[PDB]
Amino acid sequence: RKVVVSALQFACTDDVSTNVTTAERLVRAAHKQGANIVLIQELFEGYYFCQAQREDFIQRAKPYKDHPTIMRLQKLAKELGVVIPVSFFEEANNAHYNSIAIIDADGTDLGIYRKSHIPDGPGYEEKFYFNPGDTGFKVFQTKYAKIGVAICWDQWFPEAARAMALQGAEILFYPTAIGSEPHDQSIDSRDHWKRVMQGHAGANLVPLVASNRIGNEIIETEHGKSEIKFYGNSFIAGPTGEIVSIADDKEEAVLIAEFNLDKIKSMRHCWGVFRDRRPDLYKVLLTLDGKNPVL
Amino acid sequence: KGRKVVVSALQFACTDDVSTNVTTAERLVRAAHKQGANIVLIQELFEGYYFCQAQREDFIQRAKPYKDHPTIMRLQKLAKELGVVIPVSFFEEANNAHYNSIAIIDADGTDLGIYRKSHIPDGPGYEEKFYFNPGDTGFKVFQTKYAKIGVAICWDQWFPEAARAMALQGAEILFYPTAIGSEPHDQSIDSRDHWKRVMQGHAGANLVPLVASNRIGNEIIETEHGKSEIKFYGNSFIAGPTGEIVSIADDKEEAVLIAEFNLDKIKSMRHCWGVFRDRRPDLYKVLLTLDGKNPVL
Amino acid sequence: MAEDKGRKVVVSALQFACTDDVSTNVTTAERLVRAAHKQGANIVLIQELFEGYYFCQAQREDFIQRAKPYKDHPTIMRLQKLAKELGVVIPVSFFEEANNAHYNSIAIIDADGTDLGIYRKSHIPDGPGYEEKFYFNPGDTGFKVFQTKYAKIGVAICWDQWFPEAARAMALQGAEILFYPTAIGSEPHDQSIDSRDHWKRVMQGHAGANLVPLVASNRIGNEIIETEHGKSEIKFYGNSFIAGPTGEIVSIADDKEEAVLIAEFNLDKIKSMRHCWGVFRDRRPDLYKVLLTLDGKNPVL
Amino acid sequence: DKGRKVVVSALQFACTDDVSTNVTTAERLVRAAHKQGANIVLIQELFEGYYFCQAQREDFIQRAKPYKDHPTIMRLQKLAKELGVVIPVSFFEEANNAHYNSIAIIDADGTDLGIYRKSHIPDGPGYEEKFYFNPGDTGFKVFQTKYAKIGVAICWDQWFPEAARAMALQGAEILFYPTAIGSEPHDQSIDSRDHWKRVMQGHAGANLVPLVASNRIGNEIIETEHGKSEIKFYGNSFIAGPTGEIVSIADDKEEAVLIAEFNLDKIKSMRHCWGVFRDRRPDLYKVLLTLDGKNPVL
Amino acid sequence: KGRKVVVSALQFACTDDVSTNVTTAERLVRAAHKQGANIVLIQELFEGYYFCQAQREDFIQRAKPYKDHPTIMRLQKLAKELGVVIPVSFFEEANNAHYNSIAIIDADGTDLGIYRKSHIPDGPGYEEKFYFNPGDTGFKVFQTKYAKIGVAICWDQWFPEAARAMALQGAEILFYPTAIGSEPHDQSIDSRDHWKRVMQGHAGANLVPLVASNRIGNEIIETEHGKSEIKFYGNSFIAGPTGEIVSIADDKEEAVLIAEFNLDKIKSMRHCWGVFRDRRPDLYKVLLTLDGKNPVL
Amino acid sequence: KGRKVVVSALQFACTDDVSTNVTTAERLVRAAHKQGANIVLIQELFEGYYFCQAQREDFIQRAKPYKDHPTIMRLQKLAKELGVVIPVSFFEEANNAHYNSIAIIDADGTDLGIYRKSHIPDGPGYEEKFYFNPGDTGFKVFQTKYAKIGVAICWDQWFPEAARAMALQGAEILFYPTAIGSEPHDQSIDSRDHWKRVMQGHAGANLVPLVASNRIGNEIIETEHGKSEIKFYGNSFIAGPTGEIVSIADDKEEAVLIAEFNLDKIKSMRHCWGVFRDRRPDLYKVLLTLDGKNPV
């Protein structure tokens, strides 16, 4: 069982149809290079608007139901025969989420995952827009494989990766948007960010895919202009956490790595980390302060 | 710029003859429509006297099935003729069950369904518990031609849970037909101020406009223990999304209240304020108890 | 001076003995239906499986083939003509064949002769003398009410009458009167069992708890059936009766006479009494989930 | 005649509106029942005072007390322990802002086994219980006592076959119903006593379990918001067998101690053999979870 | 190459003493274990004579609760000692309901839960409908240390629906404890060949091995109408995944039957045959009727 | 005493010439009738070689519409002449759809309607998938002058659900025209015993007789890869209501199997055994899933 996977890395304008045209052109090229499962970066429908905390930007959200972009990638997914996770800003009555729709090989929409861990701070004011996720971590059974799909900031938490691997995830996927921070140009998070994810891969014995955007984006915030240089470094790690394919910080990229899933599962089962786990001693992970279980 | 909706609260006195009262409601619905109304709200159990001052066997038989109801059917023609949304309050018989109900008529005459009053009041003058099974529809919202609306009934207006339930389901405007006034056992009770404040609270906490239509007039009912009298205090009103009263009637006059809301700006104002983004349903389990400890089955 | 308003309806319970010849028993039924109609009856109730002996004392292959389809049933068709002639409602109890399934059924014939449909016995009894589980699939129509020319009625069959759930299911759906055709008597394996008083009190309890009148028609006579282990006898104990909405018995037959019982009810006054008493206003379905278990803990799928 | 035997008792008495007096009365009669061999003794509903629900008064709501350290429950626990008898104690419960018509089941060793909160709440002239009590939220319960597994419910609950069946399905071997019922102050023509008995006898026969009903006697006048209101409570406390037969019954005005012995092993055997529980059709009972015959409640 | 499992069907005659019969089971389980068995199947209602020839009040009281059942508890010790999976058939009392049930004990002694007999037979010699409520667990599969298995009971074995339900839920092997023999009212009835053919059919249609353990011996029961005799015919067998019988007992002696199955090669063979991807559940709705027309509720 | 019906299973080798095969079918139907048959079953797709081996474009044109089918019409004449029921297997063209189908002809020559094969497999020697859409008729029963019958086709015969569906609706006899033999990929599998066991299973579980007609002979079709060959193993048989084989053919010669059944006695036996009285459809919802969890 040989599933091919791809990481995509492009620049965005602040125009839905031009951006979707970009993803649509890079997904078709992935399929040309033999891709089965194609990953598109976070909130690629537009500029990373979370630098500002503006009332009108909340109204960029749209319902999950009959979503114009989901609907347009389902046709593309079905025609190529590729799995495609679709990042979008979701409105649900008065709730709002940073969410992703998993569209299978036949165009079928298999459901939704809602970003659980929400970042905050200058340039990344995501807590102003998103309710923290209520779906829980999910695995999606696709024609090619069982896949763990979470979103951006979720990639920093070992709990997310572990939860997905416990639920049958043969591969983990993370659509991302990260770069410089507008308040301090001395902050360079690229090495640290790769390292944390490399750790999830090696600890669970599952390959990993991270798609991150590039280019410069200037947002008109409530306090004047704010700029981010997204640093790319979209990559694919193997089940031991090794970097097999890696993009640069500036150029557009279409990554590919083929994995023998049945043999990676024999590698995982023989190492026996899952049978060796001690859930009886992990109750402290249900606390925030290291003593009080949350309700 | 944005979807606009003109809403209206009506306030009038009732005899105990259905034909008269429906004729009265029709006259006021037309006057609201002449002033630009798209959704018009008629007071609770308007077809007759507020009979719940008595606990009488024979009054139970005022109920009628939802199916082919002559007052709903008559008002469906009006809605369609005028292009107006009309929630119609009525006493429902459903086999051996009975409910204080309301059917939502859309601007094209279409009966969109019903809501059965959930919280049932009790005590001298307001013996509703004797007549109505507690509602089993749960809180609802209705997609009309002008807006998603949440309609509940009278006593439901005192419960933040009901307004919150409707808002969570996408209600853009809340409506409460009412029958409230003095209490026959104690002349010192005057609940009008308290009544308004609690509702203003719902409107401000959910950032949605709110409409309340209340009865006026004195009604004297023969009860199992003699005459009982209520002076209904009107005070029908419309409140905006921060709870401010934008239209209000006095305690005796017949009234047609009008108010226009921009529903796209309000949606935008509601999301911006962030309350729905910040709710903690994980910490609200206690609300599924009556006694602060034991969850209900 | 005027009569008290409200729809009146006159109901009747019949009580008779059967032979094992279908023509003789339908002739008996028709004679008694006509006698009931002569006394003013609007709805007449014939006892369970009246077409023959209560054959369920035996567990025999050949007795299963006594079933017949609901479609073009000779007995139903014949009683349809009688109902139309007299202008009376007649529920018709019969053993139904439905491809490979079999049921103990009842067809409700309206006062204009129209077949309004069927109910299939839900609770199936078992044991010496009453081996019904051998013949009948448990009913799959669920509890029903039928809108007749005179009233909305609830009809169930024999063993069903021991279950408060059935009576309440019918009342909840608007049944204004309950009917139960019955075949019950002595038990061949133990002559000390005399269930007649127990039988009455359970049904009177249904009428009182739902505030609806109730009609039970039961068989009389001794019947001997040839079983796989020899002859077995039941003495059917009659006691057909009509009960009012507080459970009071208004008419009752003895254990051996042929009877035509007659009682008039004002359905509008009883409706009003039923609602004022308030039991239906006060019910707690939220606490009744345990009723959907057999063992008090596990809900059935 | 082998098998576990249990002796049950129904008490019937008049109440004043003073708590100390009425509890002294209950203790007198529980001792009289025990002297006659009773193992489980049933005291009538809200016996601590007059049946105050004829009125709808603010101040009457404050007669309620917490379940915790309830003085009447504590006093009767001592008596239960002294005599070795099971004693259900009816009381008006305050639980934060909720209020219930409740009953605490005291075992023969004096242990508080838990509470049942009245589910079906009556309403109308003379019986304005819906003004005082939240409808109960414990659900129907059964309690394992030293003598038997029992099902205890309260007053108006006795009209509902669903409550008896719920208790039977969960193993209840005897059903107990403390009661307060009599005339109705708005219409002297209403006499519910035969209807009342008939419905309970229905429960006993349909579930094949014995049933004990203890009812109040005497005239009571309550000062209501609209003037005096009077009820004459009609007694008729009784004990029914597993076929619904009345085995013991009191009149409408006598103070009474009723006594009945039951063989629970033989009744269990009879119950199972009759087959009603073997033959039930819960797959066809969903309509029971509706009020209107059509719509399942949330 | 793959996960191997050795299964066993046991066959013996019952006495009227419980302990004797559990000890007979214990002796035969140890004999299966000695010959390499991992999962061992004991016949239906093995604790005593097949009492269902009679319809008696006192026989119903032979039932016992699932909780702290002495026979289940004793067999748990044996399961843990030998490291063998043991399904334990028993007559369950559950408040007022009664069932013909079976508890699946895992190789470490753990009680995995129970299955209640779904299809209850009836007629002379087999009056089971008098004793048991139809099962309400539905068909189940259990995950044991050696395999996911489907266990159903006696009469259940005549129904293609039970066997399919278990395989669809992942059963790798079907098990059917049985009590079947002659019929007391008609000596011409010999159902043994028909009985095997139907099960062999289940094995072949689902491509899973099947094990059936049947009783031997003549039993005379005192019924309400005199003596009734059944001659139990044994013929316990184990069938492979195409329905071929690979081990079979005679009609009169004790037997310990043993067979090994490569469950991964069988899984692969089942997947390859493809029957399960080729089913048409969209065309099977009539299976939810009894009469070929009306779906049950 | 009771309705007696004589049924027949025919078995022969096909040539790849339509006329010849139809003439062969006719000869054997007449032979069956001469031995007393009332209902006669001809094997699946008898008009030619079993072509589902290969996946060829020109083979699709062997399909013909249900209306005015020349083989059906000719067999209608034969049914009316002799007074025998004849289910006619054929390759149906219906617009953008094609089906493996069978039309039931009554003893008076009346076309009673059709059933379209429901279960469509894959695999070498039997690539049914490329030629036939999944049947949309559902499982049917047909009332003939002699009995209510249920008919299903080739691959359908592995599915207990189809046999049960027919029996629930009144089928008193089940008919299964088929084509099965070796597999061109590996000559070690011999499925004839597995096949018989599953069908005997359906006869015994539903207490209905069952007739299966299978072809004999070797057949070589030129395909995409190269010459594919199959040896059809015959073994046509008639089973009774307990699943006993009452009549059976070998793997190499023509046969006309005959068996008489008393449908009234069998119906009485079926009901007394009780399986239909004892079914639990309230516990069978999982059967409306493919994966054993989610309804379709």
Residue numbers in the entry:
A (entry chain G): 7 to 301
B (entry chain E), E (entry chain B): 5 to 301
C (entry chain C): 1 to 301
D (entry chain D): 4 to 301
F (entry chain A): 5 to 300
Sentences copied from the publication:
The arginine route involves three enzymatic steps: (i) arginine decarboxylation to agmatine by arginine decarboxylase (ADC, EC 4.1.1.19); (ii) deimination of agmatine by agmatine iminohydrolase (AIH, EC 3.5.3.12) and (iii) hydrolysis of N-carbamoylputrescine (NCP) to putrescine by N-carbamoylputrescine amidohydrolase (CPA, EC 3.5.1.53), with the release of carbon dioxide and ammonia. N-carbamoylputrescine amidohydrolase enzymes belong to nitrilases, and more precisely, to C-N hydrolases breaking non-peptide bonds using Cys-Glu-Lys catalytic triad. The octameric MtCPA enzyme is assembled into an incomplete helical twist, made by four tight dimers with swapped C-termini. As in other nitrilases, the substrate hydrolysis is carried out by the catalytic triad, composed in MtCPA of Glu48 (proton acceptor), Lys121 (proton donor) and Cys158 (nucleophile).
The structures of wild-type MtCPA, crystallized in the presence of PUT and CAD in the solution, were determined at 1.97 and 2.19 Å resolution, respectively. In that instance, there would be not enough room to bind entire CAD molecule. This is not the case, and we do indeed observe CAD in the active site. CAD in MtCPA complex reaches deeper than PUT into the catalytic pocket, however, due to presence of sulfhydryl group of Cys158 it bends toward Glu132. All bound amines, CAD, PUT and DHMP, present the same hydrogen bond between terminal amine group and the side chain oxygen of Glu187. Although CAD is able to interact via hydrogen bond with Glu187 at the entrance of the pocket, similarly to PUT and DHMP, deep inside the cleft CAD passes by the Sγ of Cys158 and bends toward the pair of glutamates. Thus, this would not leave enough space for the carbamoyl moiety of such longer substrate. From the MtCPA/CAD complex, we can assume that longer substrates than NCP, such as N-carbamoylcadaverine, would not obtain stable conformation inside the active site. In other words, the proper orientation of N-carbamoylcadaverine, with the preservation of the hydrogen bond with the Glu187 side chain is impossible due to steric clashes either with the catalytic triad or with the residues in the middle section of the pocket.
